[PDB]
Design a protein around this ligand. Structure first.
Ligand SMILES: Nc1ncnc2c1ncn2[C@@H]1O[C@H](COP(=O)(O)CP(=O)(O)OP(=O)(O)O)[C@@H](O)[C@H]1O
Ligand SMILES: [Cl-]
Ligand SMILES: [Cl-]
Ligand SMILES: [Cl-]
Length: 388
């Protein structure tokens, strides 16, 4: 079932679709903030206040952070992962930024067992490529300011290091210049939609993760548009790809599969390789509708399917290399024999070029070192991960 290929050609099908829209209810927003404040004055939540530097009204936002395991509890005031609340210049309480609900990998929670999924969800199933960077949230404030956030933060960090949020905003400025639109226009459009744009910042020249994003592929991969309400309502992916084209984002590849057993089959087939349609793929985020009643009312619901290998091995090599440099014992947990060889190769590379240690610590040279060892071994990552 690898007839299915991730596509960024869906924007055309969006012509027949219409964006979900729900306005905010200030009373429900106030009640949510009250419940979050109470929680914070003791399911533990942390509040951080940020000034919006660009705001002509001196707007401030409160970022709310939960522990990822607390999302498994019932009766949370919200399941948003990334949530920023504000008061307008008029004293109205609003959600400024709303992330996706926390979602889990297969067999991580009762809800994400294949039996549970098969029973309680309905398709069509959107399989969205899981791009490997940091999350960026974009929204428009009541006063017209474009807000750009990382998962829990906004603004530049006090030193000469660029924050993730500022780096995201600099990519956004470039993509807007390219298509001839402004931050003001984007802020007005997101406010009109009562929406948060959800993107993955992927740029090796800024920070390396595991998958490579060279200059031609670097920027903001738009993977979501959420409504700024306590509930979770997200755009269908073809409308996300249409918004991506209109506002100069990179598109997130999409596969729509009707039948849940075909979804399972496809994902298991890719799991063998950890690659799809020529490219390395770290995972998929599967988007569908779920009902509490297994046969009631339906709500937008996500789960992920991570591909364990070779990406687990690569992450181990990165952490082992940073330990080597820092003097802490490398934690070898898997791929023991090939990792022993990698660490001797790494030690040789660091001895030959002593600049590399400081670069590796700043998340530059990590992918190159991994690929240099694999070339040295005349192996593909997938082969290296299969040895053990
Ligand atoms: N198509 C997509 N749909 C949804 N999320 C996507 C995505 N592509 C990438 N992502 C990223 O996947 C993240 C969710 O993954 P999770 O498994 O919940 C935590 P993670 O990916 O291990 O990273 P984190 O703990 O550093 O946030 C989102 O925060 C977003 O940054
Ligand atoms: Cl309205
Ligand atoms: Cl992140
Ligand atoms: Cl308004």
């Amino acid at each position: 079932a690898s007839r299915y290929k991730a596509s960024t050609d869906y924007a055309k099908d969006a012509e027949g679709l219409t964006a979900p829209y729900v306005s905010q209810d200030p009373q429900e927003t106030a009640a949510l903030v009250r419940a979050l404040d109470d929680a914070a004055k003791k399911f533990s939540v942390k509040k951080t206040r940020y000034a919006v530097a660009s705001s002509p009204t001196g707007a401030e936002v409160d970022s709310w952070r939960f522990n990822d395991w607390d999302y498994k509890k019932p009766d949370l005031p919200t399941y948003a992962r990334g949530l920023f609340t504000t008061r307008t210049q008029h004293g109205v309480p609003e959600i400024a930024v709303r992330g996706y609900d926390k979602f889990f990998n297969i067999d991580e929670t009762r809800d994400t067992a294949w039996s549970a999924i098969r029973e309680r969800t309905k398709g069509p199933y959107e399989l969205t490529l899981k791009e490997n960077g940091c999350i960026i949230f974009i929204s428009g404030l009541e006063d017209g300011t474009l807000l750009v956030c990382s998962k829990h933060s906004t603004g530049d960090r006090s030193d000469v290091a660029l924050s993730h949020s500022s780096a995201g905003e600099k990519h956004l400025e470039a993509q807007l210049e390219r298509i001839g639109k402004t931050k003001e226009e984007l802020a007005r459009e997101l406010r009109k939609r009562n929406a948060t744009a959800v993107a993955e910042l992927c740029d090796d020249s800024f920070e390396e993760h595991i998958l490579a994003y060279g200059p031609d592929k670097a920027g903001l991969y738009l993977h979501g548009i959420n409504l700024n309400i306590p509930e979770f309502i997200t755009y269908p992916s073809p409308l996300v790809q249409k918004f991506a084209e209109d506002w100069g984002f990179r598109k997130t590849g999409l596969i729509i599969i009707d039948n849940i057993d075909d979804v399972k089959a496809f994902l298991e087939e890719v799991a063998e390789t950890g690659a799809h349609d020529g490219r390395d793929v770290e995972g998929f985020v599967i988007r569908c509708k779920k009902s509490t009643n297994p046969g009631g009312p339906y709500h937008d619901w996500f789960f992920k399917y991570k591909f364990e290998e070779p990406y687990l091995m690569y992450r181990q090599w990165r952490e082992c290399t940073k330990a080597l440099i820092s003097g802490k014992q490398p934690k070898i947990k898997k791929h023991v024999k090939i990792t022993e060889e990698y660490l001797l190769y790494a030690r040789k590379r660091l001895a030959a070029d002593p600049k590399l240690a400081k670069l590796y610590n700043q998340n530059h040279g990590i992918i190159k070192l991994r690929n240099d060892f694999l070339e040295y071994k005349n192996m593909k990552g997938t082969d290296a991960a299969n040895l053990e």
